[PDB]
Design a protein around this ligand. Structure first.
Ligand SMILES: [Cl-]
Length: 545
């Protein structure tokens, strides 16, 4: 039927920017970079960015424009047999939506805690803080720390994150009592998401100019502060300098490549839908490439701020930069609050920073949720619309997503969240989907043939850059990284201290496999449903419907 077209050009640019700019740049990139030793992460991240990321991200926009369909139905138009890619993308979003909304929930909890005379993370006087708590300034003092032994003393910010916000249990094995305070916060984030999606994204556009700007503005203040903070240079040096030994290890490549696919929201089908709304004759090539620069740029800039603060923390604590914070999702929630403590009028700034996180994440969440809803409706549009069931489907998806979300808001919730984050919507699942989409477009549809289509749409022939990426560079990268993970296998660990139970690792592979399995399974299912000689069936299916 009718397809919505973004007004002018801004309605599209802002929406895509909201899509790929969010907690992936702020929360995820620093955490992955920290766990993978600074620059050692950057070389894979950049090789993937201009080799696989930027091309595939544009690819999704192009197919959206040309097909004029949602991410699932789009694949049937291009290559009917491989419609598995569209289904795989949906499973991947659903899992992402569940975990992504919990990062936002922690921020909501933080915002509520931000409203008090003394910031909670500032001192060890608080009840949650254990006997092993010492203020960073006290640690800096030689008399308090160097003179007097204090085994395993932890920064109050770390204790507050670990023992108040998370109530970390010893392990995933014991989930512990569901934390009511966090669950209520999770409900609040979900309620905002459901209601905003109910009313649609039209309301957001009128004020977007300010809402998009506020995060960039707040990030800039944090950036200025960290560099001003003493010890900033060591943090920047750790960030920038690349360790060649780590490059040899497979883990870094997988985390970096997937971060590119997670940050740009490639293979989550979200980008394809945005492209579909965009008009046929639009120079998306110019816009998407410019937009991409922003995503990587903001990730790189947010990185400088996080690392400079870590350098400051390292100075005062006396610990090495590698060990000063959690090597995990907690890093954004540990480093940045410390910066706020140092800022003048810290209470005022803390509220600002958490609001930024909420705005950045919620905008991304709305797009992902909207994309999931639209693709699912696309499968049976007539059936859903006539009924009031479509009107409730959004509620149904949110309610289920909240209920599965509960597992991550328990005391042992972080362990489940880390399992989800590495295994689902990151890991090999994104790599598998990426290879498959590139393989189909480049080899079956014809990359050179697509170029003819793109050239008509954007008004000029695209540079050979993309064609060689979809054909050879993205496939080789994705297959090779997957091959390493199988060849040299290290099970995931939390903060380098928690060996995961065999069952949990298996459960995680079940999260990754279900999405990965979709594409082969649908290939098999399609072939079976079609009738005729197998060669004839393959040929009929391969040709675009
Ligand atoms: Cl990024």
């Amino acid at each position: 039927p009718q397809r919505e077209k973004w007004s002018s050009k801004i309605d599209f640019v802002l929406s895509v920017a909201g899509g790929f700019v969010g907690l992936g740049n702020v929360w995820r990139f620093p955490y992955l970079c920290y766990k993978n030793g600074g620059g050692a992460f950057l070389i894979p991240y950049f090789i993937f960015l201009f080799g696989s990321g930027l091309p595939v991200f544009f690819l999704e926009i192009i197919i959206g424009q040309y097909t004029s369909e949602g991410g699932i139905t789009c694949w049937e138009k291009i290559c009917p047999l491989f419609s598995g890619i569209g289904y795989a993308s949906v499973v991947i979003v659903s899992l992402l939506n569940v975990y992504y909304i919990v990062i936002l929930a922690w921020a909501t909890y933080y915002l509520f805690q931000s409203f008090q005379k003394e910031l909670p993370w500032a001192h060890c006087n608080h009840s949650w803080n254990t006997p092993h708590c010492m203020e960073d300034t006290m640690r800096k003092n030689k008399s308090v720390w160097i003179t007097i032994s204090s085994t395993n003393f932890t920064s109050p910010v770390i204790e507050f994150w670990e023992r108040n916000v998370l109530s970390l249990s010893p392990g995933i094995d014991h989930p512990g009592s569901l934390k009511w305070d966090l669950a209520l916060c999770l409900l609040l984030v979900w309620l905002v998401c459901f209601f905003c999606i109910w009313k649609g994204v039209r309301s957001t556009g009128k004020v977007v100019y300010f809402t998009a700007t506020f995060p960039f503005a707040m990030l800039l203040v944090l950036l200025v502060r960290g560099l001003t903070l003493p010890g900033a240079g060591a943090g920047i040096k750790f960030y920038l300098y690349p360790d060649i030994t780590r490059l040899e290890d497979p883990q870094v490549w997988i985390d970096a490549g997937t971060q590119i696919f997670f940050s740009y929201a490639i293979c989550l089908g979200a980008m394809t839908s945005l492209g579909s709304y965009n008009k046929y004759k639009y120079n998306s090539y110019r816009d998407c490439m410019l937009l991409g620069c922003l995503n990587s740029g903001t990730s790189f800039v947010s990185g400088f701020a996080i690392f400079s603060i870590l350098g400051f923390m390292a100075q005062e604590q006396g610990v090495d930069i590698a060990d000063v914070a959690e090597s995990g999702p907690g890093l954004a929630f540990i480093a940045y609050p410390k910066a706020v403590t140092m800022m003048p009028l810290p209470t005022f700034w803390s509220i600002l920073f958490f609001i930024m996180l909420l705005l950045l994440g919620l905008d991304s969440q709305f797009v992902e949720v909207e994309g999931q809803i639209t693709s699912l409706v696309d499968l049976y549009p007539s059936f859903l619309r006539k009924g009031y069931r479509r009107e409730i489907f959004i509620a149904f998806v949110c309610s289920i997503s909240y209920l599965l979300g509960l597992t991550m808001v328990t005391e042992g919730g972080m362990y489940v969240f880390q399992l989800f984050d590495y295994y689902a919507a990151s890991g090999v699942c994104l790599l598998w989907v990426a290879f498959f989409e590139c393989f189909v477009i480049a080899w079956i549809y014809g990359g050179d043939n697509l170029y003819d289509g793109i050239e008509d749409m954007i008004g000029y022939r695209p540079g050979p850059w993309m064609k060689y990426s979809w054909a050879v560079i993205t496939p080789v990268l994705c297959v090779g990284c997957f091959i390493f993970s199988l060849v040299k296998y290290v099970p995931l660990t939390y903060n380098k201290t928690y060996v995961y139970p065999n069952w949990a690792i298996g459960l995680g592979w079940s999260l990754a496999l279900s999405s990965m399995l979709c594409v082969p399974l649908v290939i098999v299912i399609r072939l079976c449903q079609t009738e005729g000689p197998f060669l004839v069936r393959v040929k009929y299916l391969l040709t675009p419907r």
